[PDB]
Amino acid sequence: AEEVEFVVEKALSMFSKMNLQEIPPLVYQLLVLSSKGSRKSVLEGIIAFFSALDKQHNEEQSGDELLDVVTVPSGELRHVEGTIILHIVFAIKLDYELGRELVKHLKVGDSNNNLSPFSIALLLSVTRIQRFQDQVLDLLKTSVVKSFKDLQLLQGSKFLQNLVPHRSYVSTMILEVVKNSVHSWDHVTQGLVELGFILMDSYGPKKVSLSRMPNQHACKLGANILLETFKIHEMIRQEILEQVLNRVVTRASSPISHFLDLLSNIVMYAPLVLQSCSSKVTEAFDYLSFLPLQTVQRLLKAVQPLLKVSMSMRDCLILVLRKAMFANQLDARKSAVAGFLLLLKNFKVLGSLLSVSQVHVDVHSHYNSVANETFCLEIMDSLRRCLSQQADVRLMLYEGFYDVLRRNSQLANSVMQTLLSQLKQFYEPKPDLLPPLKLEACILTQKISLQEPLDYLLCCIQHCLAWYKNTVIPFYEDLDDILESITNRMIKSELEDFELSADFSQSTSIGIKNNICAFLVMGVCEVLIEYNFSISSFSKNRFEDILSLFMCYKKLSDILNEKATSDSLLSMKFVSSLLTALFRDSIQSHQESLSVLRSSNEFMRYAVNVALQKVQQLKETGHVSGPDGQNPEKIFQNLCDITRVLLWRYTSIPTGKSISLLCLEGLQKIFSAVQQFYQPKIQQFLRALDVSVTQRTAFQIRQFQRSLLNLLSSQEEDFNSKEALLLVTVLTSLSKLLEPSSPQFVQMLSWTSKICKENSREDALFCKSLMNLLFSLHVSYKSPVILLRDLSQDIHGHLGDIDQDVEVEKTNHFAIVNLRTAAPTVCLLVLSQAEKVLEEVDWLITKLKGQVPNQPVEKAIIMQLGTLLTFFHELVQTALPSGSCVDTLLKDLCKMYTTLTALVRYYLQVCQIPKNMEKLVKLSGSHLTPLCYSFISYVQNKSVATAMARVLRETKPIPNLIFAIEQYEKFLIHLSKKSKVNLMQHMKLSTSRDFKIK
Amino acid sequence: RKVQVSYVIRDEVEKYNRNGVNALQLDPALNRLFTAGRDSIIRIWSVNQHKQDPYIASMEHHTDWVNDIVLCCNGKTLISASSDTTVKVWNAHKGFCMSTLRTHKDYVKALAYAKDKELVASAGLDRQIFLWDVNTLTALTASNNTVTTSSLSGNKDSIYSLAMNQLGTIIVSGSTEKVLRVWDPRTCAKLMKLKGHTDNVKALLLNRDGTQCLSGSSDGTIRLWSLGQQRCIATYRVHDEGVWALQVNDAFTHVYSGGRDRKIYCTDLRNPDIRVLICEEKAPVLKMELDRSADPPPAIWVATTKSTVNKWTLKGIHNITPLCTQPDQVIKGGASIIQCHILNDKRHILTKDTNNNVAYWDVLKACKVEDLGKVDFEDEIKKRFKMVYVPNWFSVDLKTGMLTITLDESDCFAAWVSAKDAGFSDPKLNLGGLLLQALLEYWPRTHVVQKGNGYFQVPPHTPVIFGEAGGRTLFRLLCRDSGGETESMLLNETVPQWVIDITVDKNMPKFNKIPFYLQPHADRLSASDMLQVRKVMEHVYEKILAEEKIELLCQDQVLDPNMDLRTVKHFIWKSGGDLTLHYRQK
């Protein structure tokens, strides 16, 4: 036994000296020798040796393509590592115990420095043995998730960054395992694909914060693994697409947004898709009729890059869509309309260029534009036949006709005539009959439901007509005259002509009909407001028509609101254009006409509120409802234009809610929305407001800093709490852009610290937000343990002492901490921050414990725990309220003593005791442990099945702390025995309590 | 399969055949002759003696040997068979391909025609015989492009000849089975199996009523068959070598035959004693076409393995010394490139043609550099020898008598060459990437606007061909036609990913490296293949002006400092191990 170990160790040393091409023969023989003897030693030596080769090769490869010192070429290194892996996997097949040692040796929570590109690639091919498939893939899944938690924890804390040197992460290792797999690593691909889908299946979004980011990173890694494996390996790309389409083509309505993005990325390599995995796309097309409308629209958009270059896929889709439309079954014609819309919204050229014994013939006929027009008109005529269907189909067509008419300018006449014919069914041509719209024909009675979205029909007509007059000009006059007639008769209507307050009930039939008719009138008024703004340019007469239309819109809105919603029909481009003229227009001619609109404060509120809706839709859904609402470049341009107006109005003139306050709300929403979606365009976003990102952000930050000072300079009763809360939220979001290693960040932290130290507000919510901003800035700068200690003293001074015979001196470090906010606002906030400090220290101790730089880390750990001891020392003798403050402090003391136990257990492994560790032990025994017993006594002495659960739940915390202290003292006895220094001389005898009933 | 990109280095107009002629068709209405050439081009000629230039048009859509052509529908439609495994329908009046039939799986060698029923059959090396109706094929459109296929079956070997009678009720097949199989095209049913030939059959004939059959085989014998009696009623041993072409008159009493022996005979069927030697050609006879304007036929057109097509008068056959000595009418032919040599730079090729002329070609620019005349080809190879090594990045095939250059994914980008070494004025260049961008220059998908690679342009008329390795032709077009609407959609379907990466995505191919370890003359290093020796000289200089004090040697031979390691490894190293260079002080 020992002889086998000795000879194996000798051969391990010979690895370095001998040639690499002789390694695979040696490993195969060494694995056979391993069977009758040591198994872990052989595997450890091979893995460690090849990991060093990988690391050395990576360093020498990184650099210019000039003369490099290349000890091993990349081509032969991957070939050698590949055949070593196959030998190990084949050995595991005939030796089950060899496989168990490999999993045990590479078992992960710790970083597991043993993991490497070679060891990860070894595990992926081991999955070809079904006996090890699940546990190996589970080992890899836990490794990447834990690795991302390490990355998240390091990024958020400056204290860890100064201590922990950067180490490679499992996510990076696996990505280059895929990259290295191009050297004929076909045995790794099978387990590579399964690992990618496990990451996506287990950590995909479940929309149906601490863990969401590592889950999102883990899910994104699976998409990267699958996408890169698709490009490189041809024998596996067919399986990848089939599994992706399986997850996407379903009626389950599960969140599949991440799978749809992977499908879109895969189909960007259309020749790769068409070559091998071509039938799967067509089979998914066959199931489009059975799928729901929302799935069809998202699936067809995902495979749009494939249909853009390929005619066969486009031709097959047209055949499926034509068959689905002719099908008598419903919910399939809706998908056919959606499919035909998407094809006609995106492609100007539609069309092409069997039985057992029937074959296709390659006819060499030149492309015919005239035949293409008839092909498009045939689909356009079919879509016109779908305008008499349910209101769901009508809504889709009205949204699609604008993009269809912009794409195919040759379909403009067909679309416009179709829109005109539909409008004639609901328009009264009589010059004096009121109302001009038949709102009773839009209602289908069989239960009352909406049949025709008349408001959406005019929105499509107005936008299509607007495109017509500025794209093809350089029936249209008939449409221009109808809209003017509609506008005049809607204004002169007295709201009684629409049969509208009569019932407005949410249950009765007449109330449902009245409620729907109320929405249509408001929707029509919005569209006519948009129409009259553009037509006749800036004329006073037309703007008076807009104001008259708005009053009709607002009066009906007030009636529905008080007796009690829907999206606005204004395009985001118009809202941006309306706001700019309504607030930032100084042209002499326009001022006369704009004074009509500006005089109505309710109109001012309406214009800003609709802009807030557009931003809110972007945050919720990722796109805006109106025209061009799914174009990221045009949404961003409107975001910049709206932001400029909102910035100007708020700052130039200070202060339902006021207009300036509403602009502040829109600014906060935009800043959050821009960072969430247009992350790479932040420099362009900040540029368009009127140096680098940090310099421009600091200019805006200082601009909002002055605003907050003005409210704080006001009186306590006059304090505008709503505005101050918004300013801190804006400052918090903007401060995410500053670089922490910059003077601009230091100024932001210094300003926040000064505001907290000097301003005393009675608003608990304002204090909580301000402290959260201060702690967010501070943690990325340095350890907040000194900040935490000073805040605990303020809570002690304001709330007094539990002794009731001593007087605690009021430090007054921070004025924001007053008698009202000291608890439960500040106390709960500082306890949550000390929790994060302990999690950081617990992470360090775990790394050191598995590691065996130690002396610098050990001193910093003791320094953190030493300062955090004084923070807890102040809180354990404070007369906290009996609510969640006591519950959280008791739970946090248990975490403090658990962390102390982990530090002591670390020295048990290392000390075969330094002064700093001894002084920490002495401090814990003189300033925390005796006072913990006093606090426990203080808490207990002073004072259906739901109550039964509550009383039994309250019996948990105090015994949990008692176990934590006794567990801590148990291991200090072990350390004193092992290190021969008595650490229990600093600890007094434990104090026990007994119950006695009066 | 893997898609290959190939192109032909040729002129815009190739008036004359650049290879042999496989088939002939004569149009009596317009006095037009059709030649199916081995250069993959069908040409139309005027048989009028007044015209000093008989050339009319070239019908260029095939990519390999055109084996058979039949003129149908009163000379309005031409059906062609080719070695590219396709059957194609043409407009014989205009000269453009209308449709392509891809039902065959091997070379298509024979075409049968029934004038009365307008029925055409195509047979080939895949042992399949397919029946087609010309009117159905001619009425095909882009929308209506489906055809029901009726195929004969029962042939256990590759068909080399096919025949139909005028009425379209009998079809005979000749193959390497050494037997003749007869079917009924109407019912697609077998009738009989004629036996007696001892070799492959390449010529078949039938009379108007379809009861007598004439066959010629490689054994050198002509056999007259009776379909009523299912037996060979006469055997004629006229030629010394195999018989490859047969022609008969309307009375079906005189047979005109020719083959490998280059001699053409007119044999009387009712008695073989009357045998007239019409002529003796300069090449083996591949096909013959009779002039049926008058009885007896005044002349016969002969196609051989040479590029020249000759007409021989038949004045006096019925009225050994050959009857004719010089052909009455001659259609000129070009020269076929028979030998090819790629120079050491992997950019220029020296070719020798059938006239012994030597020419200098530029693959990169897809053009001829200069003609050298009847210069010794082997001496010219040594005269243009250069001390440089470039990896192979293209392949050359001369099956059509023209320079066709093939680019495959495996080695298309294997040749990296510095611009200074080439004629372009040094940025580092990939020859395969530059050529692909020049071939797809007119493709709008490659425009991001600048056109092409910015260094050279292939001629706009260069035929660019996309096809599967050892398979079918996916798409064929000219270089200047990529910007068209119909071509762009076809290009999106057919261009493979490995060409998209370089021409559309504008990615750069890999940079190959050679690992070499320096050893002092009495430390492994990897570098670019085009790295010069001077760079290795200066690396040692810093380890221990650089050119003057340090000299490098390999295999006990001094190394040119301006020379690169790619050339060093290929020429001087002469070993299977990693390159070793020795540094010694000057």
Side-chain angles (χ1 to χ4, degrees), chain A residues 387-406:
Chain A
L387 269 187
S388 287
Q389 295 205 5
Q390 296 177 356
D392 315 329
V393 192
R394 291 177 208 224
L395 199 74
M396 271 195 318
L397 291 169
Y398 299 154
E399 294 161 9
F401 286 164
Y402 186 52
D403 287 334
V404 169
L405 189 152
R406 287 198 304 179

Side-chain angles (χ1 to χ4, degrees), chain A residues 309-311 314 349 351-353 367-368, chain B residues 443 475 482 484-494:
Chain A
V309 295
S310 179
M311 288 179 326
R314 190 187 297 124
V349 176
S352 179
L353 262 173
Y367 160 70
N368 202 24
Chain B
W443 196 19
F475 181 46
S482 294
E485 271 265 359
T486 185
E487 283 93 2
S488 307
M489 325 174 191
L490 286 157
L491 278 177
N492 284 36
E493 209 79 59
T494 57

Side-chain angles (χ1 to χ4, degrees), chain A residues 387 394 398 418-426 452 457:
Chain A
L387 269 187
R394 291 177 208 224
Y398 299 154
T418 302
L419 289 179
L420 200 42
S421 44
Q422 195 91 342
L423 185 55
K424 296 292 185 181
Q425 305 180 30
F426 309 98
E452 162 83 12
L457 164 75

Side-chain angles (χ1 to χ4, degrees), chain B residues 214 222 224 234 236 248 252-255 267-272:
Chain B
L214 266 167
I222 305 166
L224 181 64
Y236 314 93
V248 69
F252 203 79
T253 46
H254 279 92
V255 62
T267 300
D268 181 72
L269 285 185
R270 79 193 75 188
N271 63 86

Side-chain angles (χ1 to χ4, degrees), chain A residues 309-311 357 359 361-362 364, chain B residues 98 100 145 147 149 492-493:
Chain A
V309 295
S310 179
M311 288 179 326
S357 297
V359 305
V361 181
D362 301 61
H364 311 292
Chain B
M98 308 155 37
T100 294
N145 59 1
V147 175
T149 80
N492 284 36
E493 209 79 59

Side-chain angles (χ1 to χ4, degrees), chain A residues 65-71 73 76 269 271-272 274 309-312 349 353 357-367, chain B residues 61 97-102 140-142 145-149 485-486 489 492-493 497 511 515 523-526 531 536 539:
Chain A
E65 285 195 0
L66 207 60
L67 294 85
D68 297 13
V69 180
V70 174
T71 61
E76 76 165 5
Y269 299 83
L272 296 193
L274 291 155
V309 295
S310 179
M311 288 179 326
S312 64
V349 176
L353 262 173
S357 297
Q358 272 213 309
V359 305
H360 273 103
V361 181
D362 301 61
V363 186
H364 311 292
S365 60
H366 282 297
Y367 160 70
Chain B
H61 194 272
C97 181
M98 308 155 37
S99 51
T100 294
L101 309 163
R102 310 212 190 239
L140 283 196
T141 61
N145 59 1
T146 187
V147 175
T148 300
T149 80
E485 271 265 359
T486 185
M489 325 174 191
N492 284 36
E493 209 79 59
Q497 181 68 43
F511 270 96
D523 198 28
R524 282 211 172 183
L525 295 169
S526 290
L531 191 76
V536 176
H539 166 79

Side-chain angles (χ1 to χ4, degrees), chain B residues 144-348:
Chain B
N144 181 13
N145 59 1
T146 187
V147 175
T148 300
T149 80
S150 57
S151 66
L152 306 178
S153 61
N155 205 337
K156 317 274 149 205
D157 222 341
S158 64
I159 296 93
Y160 275 76
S161 52
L162 211 61
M164 264 179 202
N165 64 335
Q166 273 74 350
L167 318 175
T169 76
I170 286 297
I171 175 161
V172 177
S173 178
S175 73
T176 51
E177 292 179 355
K178 304 172 281 291
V179 307
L180 308 182
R181 295 186 178 272
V182 188
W183 293 268
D184 196 290
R186 302 162 301 181
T187 67
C188 297
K190 317 186 183 182
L191 276 71
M192 65 184 73
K193 189 196 296 187
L194 310 163
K195 313 172 72 95
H197 274 302
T198 62
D199 206 343
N200 180 21
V201 179
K202 290 181 174 179
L204 286 180
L205 289 167
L206 288 157
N207 46 3
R208 204 211 41 101
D209 63 78
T211 74
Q212 267 183 340
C213 181
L214 266 167
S215 72
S217 170
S218 302
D219 51 42
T221 70
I222 305 166
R223 288 181 180 265
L224 181 64
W225 310 85
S226 180
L227 269 76
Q229 309 180 8
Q230 307 198 2
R231 62 172 200 111
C232 179
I233 59 189
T235 304
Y236 314 93
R237 274 161 260 280
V238 163
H239 298 265
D240 303 68
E241 275 165 77
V243 171
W244 295 357
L246 277 188
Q247 286 287 272
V248 69
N249 50 21
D250 298 284
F252 203 79
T253 46
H254 279 92
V255 62
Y256 305 81
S257 55
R260 182 173 165 86
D261 62 339
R262 308 173 184 183
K263 315 229 189 183
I264 301 184
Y265 285 96
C266 181
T267 300
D268 181 72
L269 285 185
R270 79 193 75 188
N271 63 86
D273 289 327
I274 315 167
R275 186 180 299 112
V276 179
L277 172 60
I278 293 156
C279 75
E280 204 275 340
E281 274 277 9
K282 304 272 151 303
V285 170
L286 290 185
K287 189 76 69 168
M288 300 176 316
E289 187 73 11
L290 262 185
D291 197 353
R292 307 192 181 277
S293 54
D295 194 12
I300 183 163
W301 289 90
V302 187
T304 64
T305 48
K306 276 165 141 53
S307 56
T308 303
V309 186
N310 301 324
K311 181 178 80 68
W312 306 85
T313 43
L314 308 178
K315 303 321 222 293
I317 290 174
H318 318 296
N319 182 26
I320 318 181
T321 293
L323 165 71
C324 316
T325 300
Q326 313 284 130
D328 183 348
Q329 193 166 347
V330 174
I331 293 175
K332 309 168 185 341
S336 315
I337 291 157
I338 54 181
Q339 188 150 30
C340 165
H341 183 256
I342 306 169
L343 294 192
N344 276 330
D345 50 2
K346 300 321 179 41
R347 185 184 174 184
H348 288 268

